[PDB]
Design a protein around this ligand. Structure first.
Ligand SMILES: [Mg+2]
Ligand SMILES: [Zn+2]
Ligand SMILES: [Zn+2]
Lengths: 482, 1337
């Protein structure tokens, strides 16, 4: 089968629909992993440098209830934000952090008391569920800083291993065992490798690439072992949701292909509407709250629906209609039919315009614009004799008699102007831009010949009487009728 | 200018980058309102260029002040426009895509490279699963699909050493990986060790292929795409219409599709999406690519809401609507016209009408320039307004300009050259074009609503060609055949035929004239009869001496019309010319003779005066028709009463339950036929001389004035069949079946038709009409395919100094001589000294132009075969010699180099081909008899009977010519032995229709042997008589039990032995075939001459002869000599174990044994001898016989088919078109080149002109000749341009580009398609200038 519709419907035909807790379980695994990446935020180097500074940054502009704070907290009840309750819920969070931290220093990082207090910092957290963009950038400040260390891990590995040699089996147990000092070098080289003794002519840049790596630490102010731990702890915290959503999406594939193929009349096409519904479903998979307790298919039907209903507006036409005009046009192609009911005969646009609620000119204008274009390759000849492309005339370039007329005209003007005093002819030629790429002014017959200006007016007038002069005006007179 | 050749190789992505001027990223074209370009879409003005010239979008920098400036305000370069046609963009793709024509085309050029099959790679790339991109371990293979659950085994087994995943990149890396060199030199190194069988030839295939890519220079990486150019905007435009509607090329659709899918793939690859969608997007990207490349070939075509599919790039080069056939070869014309035509009876030859309206319209530039020259219209406003106002001077100056200003004339269809000519204008205010009536024939034009078209020679080479070459006065003979084209149309001939007539009845018998003056005084006074043989005086002349006229006078009792006419004759001829009643044959021969001796100019004025005079007095002659010019015969009721009684008897016979229908029905038709053929007699007797008009006597009758016999006698209109269908019965009538109705047309047009007779005629009318309307295509194809072959021939040596070539014998067969050898010899060189039937009477020293002194000297002689140094037999390499061609017909002398033809052949052959689709041996007269190469027998009765199928009877005259030629059944029964002499008009053979007798000249016992019930035979009683024997079924009806073995009832004696054929040691029994039913039983004895068995009973072929398709069903001529024997035994067809004397036996061919054979199971044939009753493939002739015999065979057959239709062409054409068949040289040996490589026979001669010469005695190889057809030779050509013009342009383009072809533009269509000159015609002088230059350093 050559069709991607059979292929695709057979391929979506593979996976089934998982319903009524696997939806909410996808949601719960998603939110869990999410909660653990924000845990990984809670145990930060310089990368974040936000958590509370962010809230002081959103309040610092003297008052805001705008886009960001509906990207911030937006807490679910397991609404217009009164800042009273905002300043209420942040106090205990700060208290929890400050009471946890001093014990994170007591006897160790995660001393048993310290670790139960990190657990308390976590149980206090999991009754929150919050969302987009700046929190995305917050974790991007960890993603790029992931790439600071891999960046150096690539640089020094390249500049060392690719000219030198070394084994691998020893390296992992040696590098992870200390990670901090070079005792593993003299322990690896405790034995031998006189090829290692060849270490000359490159020395000055090797521990200068190691300079670039080691400086990452003090930037971070944070130890390489905890770097390893919390980075893996965030990455798996991403992967959870990253693969958890696909279950929902594969379930409601048929939801999508159904909803889309409800509007696969000859509007645009099957697979494109199906794709747009798939976008709307993913919007649903991502946005759905199980805590509302509603069906997903309703929600996803909203998102699928709007997706297709406006993609068919943005797409599907060579002349890009915006939405507002389309909504007007919806009103009209609704109201016109009520009109011809009530009328019972043709509503030429005054027996149309009124009930539409808009005057005649809009109805008329839209009656004109509803002409989609008409496709040259159609056979306007009933026989295969004249595709429209053959009938088309091209009125853009020139007509040769016009070229000849213009040539004769300006040759005659050259022949007429050739016989004047030099000043008359020259001021005229240049002043009207004759025979160059300039637009000359009498300010410039001023600035160029002599700062006199009005005598140029009385020179032009004299030349015109010299040259209209109907012993000369008759090569001009055939051009009266132009 | 000068060129030799150049190299090509694949498109680098670096090359499309370099060529292109900026990436296109978007599908976006314009704004909804501000109809203006989009940045980085398809119409990116910043890439392809602006609209105006040397200006930036703001207009800062301009007019070459700021030449290489970019206006930094808009970042817009100050550059010019003709590059807008050039400047392309490009597109960088997400993932590699491949070119379909390196893929879907036959031998793939990528799959043949690797030699790994296709569907494997399809599923590698439909991604049935993971798939070995790289079987690092050859344990795993590339192109090897690995399932998600099987892949893991490859994984945990090797892990590292395999790449088994998805994509085109698999194939990319493959092409990049493989190395051609050392395979090549290795295969060579082990070629030398043992240059093996099929193994090594495919080693060798590869070795040469590999090295071909090596040394040719090629880069099969660029088989794969990474960069995609962007065709410029104006190569795919998008424009408005008056009503706001827009108009586009379909390409934009596919462009948008590809860019959108690519950008969505750029999205999906940033998200690490589930790669199933990346597979689907990859399939979709490759599909949109391949549809840009070829859309409607793959699957169901892509269509709009129209449901019509959309034209691709390829069709814009291909078939009709491509450039070539529609609008590069064949244009619409500037300054042309066309309209309805009528006659000019008072034209001179060079003249033509011109309604001065269109005179003015086409010639306005000349009259405008001339109104400015005189200065009345001082400007073009003035000239145009003056010429809209139609000044009086516009007329006189239109005449001034038009004086001596030729113009063309064109009617559709332009079959041959003379459908378009160039006359002088005659300005008229008659809206109908007038036309000199005699060129109605070359145009095939008759005035029933026709329109001609017109064309203007502006330039002076064209004007002067029109006046010297297309002119009405340089064209007086068909080059198809040297006949005049000045035939009397149908009226001047009727005129003359009336004038020079000789009655007896009118008046004025036997007085005297001193000459045609008082003949005109008399006849214009009204005294003599124009048609009355009356004594006059003549004074003819003759140029008996050395071009010196010789006066004389005499008297001749001749008609007033011949007399009065004779003065027109230009005083070089005798009076016997005019001394008959001037049949149009005479008129042909008149202007012939006139032209011949006189030169031409008399024949011109002469013919003009004869057109003039015949038209004049033919209007004075009177001609009409009346109801009584067809007849009411006196015997009309009696024939009816007789037919009435006859059919009454037929009725009563039908009543009996006897004659039942078929006998009755046929009887009825035959009697109707005879009855009204008697009516036809009655009526033609009751017109022609019924006028008894006494004159000075009792009574005398004379040809009456019917006018129908007269218009039937000249050749104007009508003939005996026309006049019967008006008079007698209209023969029989075949309904659409092809069978023949048995109850005819009885009445005629005068008497009155029946409804159904009429309706039966409508059928034949409609069938013939649909044949007419639907074969202009057939000639269309044959002609145009033949022309597309067209190359030339050029001479290089005065005489090649070579020996004989071709024989000349004339083409008399079937009827009389059809080309005198006098003509065939004419203008050619002799092969050799040639004698006379008085032998050893040499007349040439091996080579002479045999002009008609010789051809007449040898027409005088009855010498009957001469040979010619042929152009084929001319052995000058890369050309011929002049003597071998002989004479230039136009010059009438030995030809000069450079001018050459072959569409001339096409016109000559095709132009008539339009309509011209729509037992016994006798001698007729005295003479010797020269029949041979036949096995025949004096049968039991004592006359000749054929026993070898070959013979065809001929009716030979006393001089020796064939008068008739007819075919003869094998085993027939003649009453004549060849080499006797008979009175003509005799049934030489009275044959039995059903029986094909099986006579036994032997007298021996019969007994059933070799033949048994239900194996070879049935035994199945002859029911009517009642006696029987073993009954031999046909081929298919008997079971296959004994179909593998020949049934033969056997003759024996009392001993059982083979009753040997009397006179020889050969046994005599008959392998009985089907219908060979013996009637008397086993053990019965037969006698001498005794039957054991009784045996009861277009233009498409033109297509077949020209296209070189194989002959079809039956058995054929002996392929090879030596003993030949029978093979596998009738699986449908039995085979033939040939056993050549020293050659190879294994050849065996299925033959219909149903179609009886000639050579028996142990009889020998010579090669090229008939095996059966049927044709042979001509390829058998070329492969078996040489070149002369085969080409002779083809030209024989084809001109028989034409000559059948009343047809004539100088067959020089049919041989030159066969030189153009194919020149493929299949090498015999090897050593210099490959063993059987198709090479230029030219270059073959070159190598043997190098290696076989003392360089070696021989290291190389010899070579053979080949055929296989004309169209594939068109394909099989140096150039790909002439090859890539016509149908299946696609595959031709594939195979062209794959070599990176770089044609050198020498052939016709090659330089044509770029519009530059080619070797001859107008470019002849420049080409030979280059030739002398090549000779002169
Ligand atoms: Mg006609
Ligand atoms: Zn600008
Ligand atoms: Zn020759």
């Amino acid at each position: 089968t050559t069709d991607p519709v059979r292929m695709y419907m057979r391929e979506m035909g593979t996976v089934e629909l998982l319903t009524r807790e696997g939806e909410i379980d996808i949601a719960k695994r998603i939110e869990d992993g999410i909660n653990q990446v924000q845990c990984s935020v809670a145990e930060y180097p310089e990368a974040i440098t936000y958590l509370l500074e962010q809230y002081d940054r959103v309040e610092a502009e003297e008052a805001r209830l705008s886009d960001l704070i509906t990207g911030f907290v937006d807490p679910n009840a397991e609404n217009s934000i009164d800042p009273e309750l905002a300043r209420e819920k942040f106090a205990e969070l700060r208290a929890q952090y400050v009471v946890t931290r001093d014990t994170i220093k007591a006897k160790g990082r995660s001393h048993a008391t310290a670790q139960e207090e990190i657990l308390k910092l976590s149980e206090v957290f999991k009754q929150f569920r919050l969302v987009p963009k700046q929190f995305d950038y917050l974790v991007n400040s960890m993603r790029v800083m992931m790439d600071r260390v891999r960046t150096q891990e690539r640089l020094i590995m390249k500049l060392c291993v690719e000219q030198c040699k070394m084994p691998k089996k020893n390296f992992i147990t040696l590098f992870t065992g200390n990670e901090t000092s070079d005792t593993w070098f003299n322990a690896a080289i405790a034995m031998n490798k006189p090829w290692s003794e060849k270490l000359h002519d490159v020395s000055e840049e090797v521990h200068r690439a190691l300079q670039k790596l080691q400086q990452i630490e003090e930037e971070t102010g944070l130890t390489i072992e905890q770097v390893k731990d919390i980075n893996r702890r965030m990455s798996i915290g991403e992967a959870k949701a990253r693969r958890a959503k696909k279950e929902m999406v594969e379930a409601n594939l048929r939801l999508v292909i159904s909803i889309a193929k409800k509007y696969t009349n000859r509007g645009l096409q099957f697979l494109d509407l199906i794709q747009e519904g798939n976008i709307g479903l993913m919007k649903a998979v991502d946005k759905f709250e199980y805590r509302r307790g509603y069906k997903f298919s309703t929600y996803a039907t909203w998102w699928i629906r709007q997706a297709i209903t406006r993609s068919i507006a943005d797409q599907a036409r060579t002349i890009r209609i915006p939405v507002h005009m389309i909504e007007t046009i919806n009103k009209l192609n609704r109201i016109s039919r009520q009109m011809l009911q009530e009328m019972g005969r043709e509503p030429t646009p005054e027996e149309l315009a009124e009930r539409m609620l808009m005057p005649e000119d809009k109805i008329r204008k839209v009656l004109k614009i509803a002409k989609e274009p008409i496709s040259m390759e159609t056979p306007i000849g009933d026989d295969e004799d004249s595709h429209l492309g053959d009938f088309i005339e091209d009125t853009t370039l020139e007509l040769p008699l016009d070229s000849a007329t213009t040539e004769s005209l300006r040759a005659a003007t050259h022949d007429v102007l050739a016989g004047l005093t030099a000043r008359e002819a020259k001021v005229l030629r240049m002043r009207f831009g004759i025979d160059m790429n300039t637009d000359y002014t009498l300010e410039e017959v001023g600035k160029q010949f002599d700062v006199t200006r009005e005598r140029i007016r009385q020179i032009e007038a004299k030349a015109l009487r010299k040259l209209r002069h109907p012993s000369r005006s008759e090569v001009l007179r055939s051009f009266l009728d132009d | 200018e000068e060129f030799d050749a150049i190299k090509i190789a694949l498109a680098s992505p670096d090359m499309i980058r370099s060529w292109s001027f900026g990436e296109v990223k978007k599908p976006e074209t314009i704004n909804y309102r501000t109809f203006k370009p989009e940045r980085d879409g398809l119409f990116c003005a910043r890439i392809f260029g602006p609209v105006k010239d040397y200006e930036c979008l703001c207009g800062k920098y301009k007019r070459l002040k700021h030449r290489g400036v970019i206006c930094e305000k808009c970042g817009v370069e100050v550059t010019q426009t003709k590059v807008r046609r050039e400047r392309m963009g490009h597109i960088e793709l997400a993932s590699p895509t491949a070119h379909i024509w390196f893929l879907k085309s036959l031998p793939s050029r990528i799959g043949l490279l690797l030699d790994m099959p296709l569907r494997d790679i399809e599923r590698v790339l439909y991604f049935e699963s993971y798939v070995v991109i790289e079987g690092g371990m050859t344990n795993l293979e590339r192109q090897q699909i690995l399932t998600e659950e099987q892949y893991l085994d490859a994984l945990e087994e090797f892990g590292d050493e395999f790449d088994a995943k998805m994509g085109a990149e698999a194939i990319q890396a493959l092409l990049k990986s493989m190395d051609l060199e050392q395979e090549c030199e290795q295969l060579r190194e082990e070629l030398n060790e043992t240059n093996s069988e099929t193994k090594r030839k495919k080693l060798t295939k590869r070795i040469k292929l590999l090295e071909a890519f090596v040394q040719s220079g090629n880069k099969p990486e660029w088989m794969i795409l990474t960069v995609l150019p962007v065709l410029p905007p104006d190569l795919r435009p998008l424009v408005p219409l008056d009503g706001g509607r827009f108009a586009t090329s379909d390409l934009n659709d596919l462009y948008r599709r590809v860019i959108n899918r690519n950008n969505r793939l750029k999205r999906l690859l940033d998200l690490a999406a589930p790669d199933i969608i990346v597979r689907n997007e990859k399939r979709m990207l490759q599909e949109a690519v391949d549809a840009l490349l070829d859309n409607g070939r793959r699957g169901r075509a892509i269509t709009g809401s129209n449901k019509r599919p959309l034209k691709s790039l390829a069709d814009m080069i291909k078939g009709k609507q491509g450039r070539f056939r529609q609008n590069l070869l064949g244009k619409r014309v500037d300054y042309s016209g066309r309209s309805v035509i009528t006659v000019g009876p008072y034209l001179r030859l060079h003249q033509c009408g011109l309604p001065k309206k269109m005179a003015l319209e086409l010639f306005k530039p000349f009259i405008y320039g001339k109104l400015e020259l005189r200065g009345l219209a001082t400007t073009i406003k003035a000239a145009k307004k003056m010429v809209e106002r139609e000044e009086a001077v516009v007329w006189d100056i239109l005449d001034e300009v038009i004086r001596e200003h030729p113009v063309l004339l064109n009617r559709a269809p332009t079959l041959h050259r003379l459908g378009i000519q160039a006359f002088e204008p005659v300005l008229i205010e008659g809206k109908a074009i007038q036309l000199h009536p005699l060129v109605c024939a070359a145009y095939n034009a008759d005035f029933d609503g026709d329109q001609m078209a017109v064309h203007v020679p502006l330039t002076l080479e064209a004007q002067l060609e029109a006046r010297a070459l297309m002119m009405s006065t340089n064209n007086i003979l068909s080059p198809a055949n040297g006949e005049p084209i000045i035939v009397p149309s149908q009226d001047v001939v009727l005129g003359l035929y009336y004038m020079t007539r000789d009655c007896v009845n009118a008046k004025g018998e036997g007085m005297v004239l001193t000459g045609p003056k008082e003949a005109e005084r008399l006849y214009r006074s009204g005294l003599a009869s124009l048609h009355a043989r009356v004594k006059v005086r003549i004074t003819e002349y003759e140029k008996d001496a050395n071009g010196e006229l010789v006066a004389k006078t005499s008297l001749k009792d001749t008609t007033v019309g011949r007399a009065i006419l004779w003065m027109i004759v230009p005083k070089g001829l005798p009076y016997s010319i005019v001394n008959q009643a001037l049949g149009k044959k005479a008129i042909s021969k008149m202007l012939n003779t006139c032209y011949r001796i006189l030169g031409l100019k008399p024949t011109v004025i002469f013919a003009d005066q004869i057109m003039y005079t015949g038209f004049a007095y033919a209007a004075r002659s009177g001609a009409s028709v009346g109801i009584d010019d067809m007849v009411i015969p006196e015997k009309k009721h009696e024939i009816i009463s007789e037919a009435e009684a006859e059919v009454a008897e037929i009725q009563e016979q039908f009543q009996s339950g006897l004659v039942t229908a078929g006998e009755r029905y046929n009887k009825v038709i035959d009697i109707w036929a005879a009855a009204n053929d008697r009516v036809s007699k009655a009526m033609m007797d009751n017109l022609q001389t019924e006028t008894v008009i006494n004159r000075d006597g009792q009574e005398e009758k004379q040809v009456s004035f019917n006018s129908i016999y007269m218009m039937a006698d000249s050749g104007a209109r009508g003939s005996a069949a026309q006049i019967r269908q008006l008079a007698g019965m209209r023969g029989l009538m075949a309904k659409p079946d092809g069978s023949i109705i048995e109850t005819p047309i009885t009445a005629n047009f005068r008497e009155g038709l029946n409804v159904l007779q009429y309706f039966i005629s409508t059928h034949g009318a409609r069938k013939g009409l649909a044949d007419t309307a639907l074969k202009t295509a057939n000639s269309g194809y044959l002609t145009r395919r033949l022309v597309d072959v067209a190359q030339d021939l050029v001479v290089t040596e005065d005489d090649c100094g070579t020996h004989e070539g071709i024989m000349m014998t004339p083409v008399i067969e079937g009827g009389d001589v059809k080309e005198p050898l006098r003509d065939r010899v004419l203008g050619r060189v002799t092969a050799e000294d040639v004698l006379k039937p008085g032998t050893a009477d040499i007349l040439v020293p091996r080579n002479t132009l045999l002009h008609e002194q010789w051809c007449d000297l040898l027409e005088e002689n009855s010498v009957d075969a001469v040979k010619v140094r042929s152009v084929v037999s001319c052995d000058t390499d890369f050309g011929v010699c002049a003597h071998c061609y002989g004479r230039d017909l136009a010059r009438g002398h030995i030809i000069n180099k450079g001018e050459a033809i072959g569409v001339i052949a096409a016109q000559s052959i095709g132009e008539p081909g339009t309509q011209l689709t729509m037992s016994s041996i006798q001698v007729k007269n005295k003479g010797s008899i020269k029949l041979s190469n036949v096995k025949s027998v004096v049968n039991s009765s004592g006359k000749l009977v054929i026993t070898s199928r070959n013979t065809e009877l001929k009716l030979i005259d006393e001089f020796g010519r064939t008068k008739e030629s007819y075919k003869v059944p094998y085993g027939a029964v003649l009453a004549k032995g060849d080499g006797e002499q008979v009175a003509g008009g005799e049934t030489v053979a009275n044959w039995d229709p059903h029986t094909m007798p099986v006579i036994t000249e032997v007298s021996g016992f019969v007994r059933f042997t070799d033949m048994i019930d239900g194996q070879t035979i049935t035994r199945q009683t002859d029911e009517l008589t009642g006696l029987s024997s073993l009954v031999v079924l046909d081929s298919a009806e008997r079971t296959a039990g004994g179909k593998d073995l020949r049934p033969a009832l056997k003759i024996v004696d009392a001993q059982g032995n083979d009753v040997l054929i009397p006179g020889t040691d050969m046994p005599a029994q008959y392998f009985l075939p089907g219908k060979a039913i013996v009637q008397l039983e086993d053990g019965v004895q037969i006698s001498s001459g005794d039957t054991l068995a009784r045996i009861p009973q277009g233009l498409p072929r033109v297509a077949d002869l020209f296209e070189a398709r194989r002959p079809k069903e039956p058995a054929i001529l002996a392929e090879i000599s030596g003993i030949v024997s029978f093979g596998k035994e009738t699986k449908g067809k039995r085979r033939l174990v040939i056993t050549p004397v020293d050659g190879s036996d294994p050849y065996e061919e299925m033959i219909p044994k149903w179609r009886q054979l000639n050579v028996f199971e142990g009889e020998r044939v010579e090669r090229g001898d008939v095996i059966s009753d049927g044709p042979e493939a001509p390829h058998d002739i070329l492969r078996l016989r040489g070149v002369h015999a085969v080409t002779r065979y083809i030209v024989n057959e084809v001109q028989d088919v034409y000559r059948l239709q009343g047809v004539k062409i100088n067959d020089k054409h049919i041989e030159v078109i066969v030189r153009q068949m194919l020149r493929k040289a299949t090498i015999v040996n090897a050593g210099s080149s490959d063993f059987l490589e198709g090479e230029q026979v030219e270059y073959s001669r070159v190598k043997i002109a190098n290696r076989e010469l003392e360089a070696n005695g021989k290291v190389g190889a010899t070579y053979s000749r080949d055929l296989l057809g004309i169209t594939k030779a068109s394909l099989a050509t140096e150039s790909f341009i002439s090859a890539a013009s016509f149908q299946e342009t696609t595959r031709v383009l594939t195979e062209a580009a794959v070599a990176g072809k770089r044609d050198e533009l020498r052939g016709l269509k090659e330089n044509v398609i770029v519009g530059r000159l080619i070797p001859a015609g107008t470019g002849y002088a420049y080409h030979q200038d280059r030739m002398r230059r090549r000779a002169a350093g």
